[PDB]
Amino acid sequence: ASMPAVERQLIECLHHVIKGAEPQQVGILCPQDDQRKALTEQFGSKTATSFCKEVDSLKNLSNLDALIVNQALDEEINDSEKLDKFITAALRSLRTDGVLILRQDLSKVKEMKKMAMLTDYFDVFRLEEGNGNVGFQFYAVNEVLDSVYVHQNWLDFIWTLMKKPFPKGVVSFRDFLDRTQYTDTGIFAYEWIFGNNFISPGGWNQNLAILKRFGPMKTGQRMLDIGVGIGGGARQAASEFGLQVHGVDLSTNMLAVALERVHKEKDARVTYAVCDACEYEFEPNSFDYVFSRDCIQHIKDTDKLFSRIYRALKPGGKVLITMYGVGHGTLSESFKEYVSQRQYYLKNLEQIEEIAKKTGFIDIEVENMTPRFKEILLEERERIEQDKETFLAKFSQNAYDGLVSGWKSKLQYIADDNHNWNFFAAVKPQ
Ligand SMILES: C[S@@+](CC[C@H](N)C(=O)[O-])C[C@H]1O[C@@H](n2cnc3c(N)ncnc32)[C@H](O)[C@@H]1O
């Protein structure tokens, strides 16, 4: 039971990609006439639109700059053959670089991983076109905000995808995350050691201490959380400080859990989006705070990232980031192999400060929190060693041994001053 606010958001999603351009040819697949007309009125006289009411009709649409599909795939999401027919027809109908905006409510779908499974399917699907392949490039998954605020529904999704050419092996950044470090089994094993809802050292108590280093925060202020993981940090920021928190993560595995949990527990201060924080188009001058907890070691282009954060902060706004970093000790081969397998792009505090100054941040604070990181590992390790019997009731031996040796290994990395745990904070001037 949606309102006109939804259709306006769909067009906003479209404009993240095409910007100020108006699309020459638009297709609309939308079975609900009132929702369909609200969409149509969003376009002006420079746009010609063809729309249809059943998915089989996409074969009749072509040379589209954009295809908007709204609540039309109820059957397809339960039938891979029908889904395949739609994706194929959708790709054929679009020009290269054409945008697909797909809105589908998943709240009546009992499978909680459905959004994640659909996203990989879209990301992986390939269609022969000419002497190569075509497919959809992933941009984002957003929540329909009307659905959150009016219907307490956090599982109403909008995918933003773009048609691109592909060769006829080569893994996207998102898939590396979902297939390697942040798998489901990895997530539940990680959550167990760090603490409920957290994938970062020290769990609830530690995250609260870090949030406090922002200084005074007020109810209703807006925070962007980069690399929100399974949501523990965002949810705590909202419940403890009354912040409105928007969390982003590139890993669908991670966010599936965050989304499931907020959808069940219900807190309208918290929303989530799947996207790459180095690329996604955030609204400028809009956030009071940007927070990132142990995320940015995954991110190569720190320079780009900082300019985007700066851009996104309100003047006078504050950024606070913690991250894995590299120390000033002689790097060991074990540490170097560890970094490559994780694909971390590590920096030291000096480099972070240089970049922050170059970006234009003021009041820069940096801290080496490695001694704290050490206390946490030791404390965490004493817990597992004590609760050995309880772990094997839930997970396998293989997950367990990797934890003991991993914890053993990080301790040596800290000892050699290879591995650091860094704190950075700063403010946007004015
Ligand atoms: C070690 S975890 C931290 C989770 C969260 N900070 C917490 O305390 O529970 C890293 C998270 O950052 C996310 N991440 C890595 N690169 C990202 C990117 N380019 N954009 C958005 N999120 C990213 C990963 O998906 C992962 O979920």
Tab-separated table of C-alpha atoms and ligand atoms in Angstrom, residues 173 177 181-182 194 197-201 207 225-233 248-252 254-255 275-278 291-299 305 324 344, ligand 1:
chain	number	residue	atom	x	y	z
A	173	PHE	CA	35.086	-6.452	-5.448
A	177	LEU	CA	33.960	-10.005	-0.097
A	181	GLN	CA	36.322	-13.119	4.126
A	182	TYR	CA	32.626	-12.342	4.769
A	194	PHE	CA	33.549	-10.444	18.854
A	197	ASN	CA	25.963	-8.085	16.291
A	198	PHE	CA	29.601	-7.023	16.066
A	199	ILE	CA	32.402	-8.067	13.694
A	200	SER	CA	34.899	-5.694	15.282
A	201	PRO	CA	37.251	-6.101	18.292
A	207	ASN	CA	32.235	0.338	20.270
A	225	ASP	CA	28.231	4.441	9.014
A	226	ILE	CA	30.644	3.061	6.413
A	227	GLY	CA	31.116	-0.708	6.532
A	228	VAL	CA	28.230	-1.199	8.928
A	229	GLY	CA	28.649	-4.969	8.865
A	230	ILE	CA	25.809	-6.799	10.618
A	231	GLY	CA	24.537	-3.595	12.213
A	232	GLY	CA	25.571	-3.699	15.869
A	233	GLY	CA	27.282	-0.327	15.720
A	248	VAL	CA	26.277	1.100	4.151
A	249	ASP	CA	28.126	-2.090	3.339
A	250	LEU	CA	29.313	-3.657	0.124
A	251	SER	CA	28.831	-7.190	1.460
A	252	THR	CA	25.318	-8.538	0.930
A	254	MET	CA	26.699	-8.866	6.149
A	255	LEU	CA	23.758	-6.562	5.432
A	275	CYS	CA	26.875	-0.087	-2.027
A	276	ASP	CA	30.589	0.657	-2.435
A	277	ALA	CA	31.358	3.699	-0.293
A	278	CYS	CA	34.094	4.864	-2.704
A	291	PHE	CA	31.727	6.786	11.310
A	292	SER	CA	33.745	3.855	10.060
A	293	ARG	CA	34.668	0.981	12.326
A	294	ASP	CA	37.378	-1.338	11.045
A	295	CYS	CA	36.288	-1.126	7.417
A	296	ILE	CA	38.663	0.970	5.329
A	297	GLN	CA	41.641	-1.402	5.189
A	298	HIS	CA	39.545	-3.041	2.419
A	299	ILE	CA	39.667	0.181	0.438
A	305	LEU	CA	37.283	7.973	-0.041
A	324	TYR	CA	43.572	-1.941	10.744
A	344	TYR	CA	44.088	-5.294	2.688
B	1	LIG	C1	35.712	-5.976	9.694
B	1	LIG	S1	34.098	-5.397	9.177
B	1	LIG	C2	33.359	-4.173	10.312
B	1	LIG	C3	31.902	-4.248	10.612
B	1	LIG	C4	31.351	-3.181	11.519
B	1	LIG	N1	32.260	-2.064	11.450
B	1	LIG	C5	31.209	-3.678	12.918
B	1	LIG	O1	31.834	-3.101	13.850
B	1	LIG	O2	30.466	-4.666	13.167
B	1	LIG	C6	34.223	-4.701	7.519
B	1	LIG	C7	33.024	-4.344	6.820
B	1	LIG	O3	33.345	-3.237	5.917
B	1	LIG	C8	32.738	-3.515	4.694
B	1	LIG	N2	33.418	-2.993	3.534
B	1	LIG	C9	34.625	-3.288	3.037
B	1	LIG	N3	34.797	-2.527	1.943
B	1	LIG	C10	33.699	-1.763	1.757
B	1	LIG	C11	33.335	-0.812	0.802
B	1	LIG	N4	34.228	-0.472	-0.276
B	1	LIG	N5	32.138	-0.217	0.907
B	1	LIG	C12	31.301	-0.526	1.908
B	1	LIG	N6	31.620	-1.433	2.837
B	1	LIG	C13	32.805	-2.062	2.782
B	1	LIG	C14	32.703	-5.003	4.588
B	1	LIG	O4	31.614	-5.394	3.870
B	1	LIG	C15	32.586	-5.462	5.978
B	1	LIG	O5	31.269	-5.754	6.250
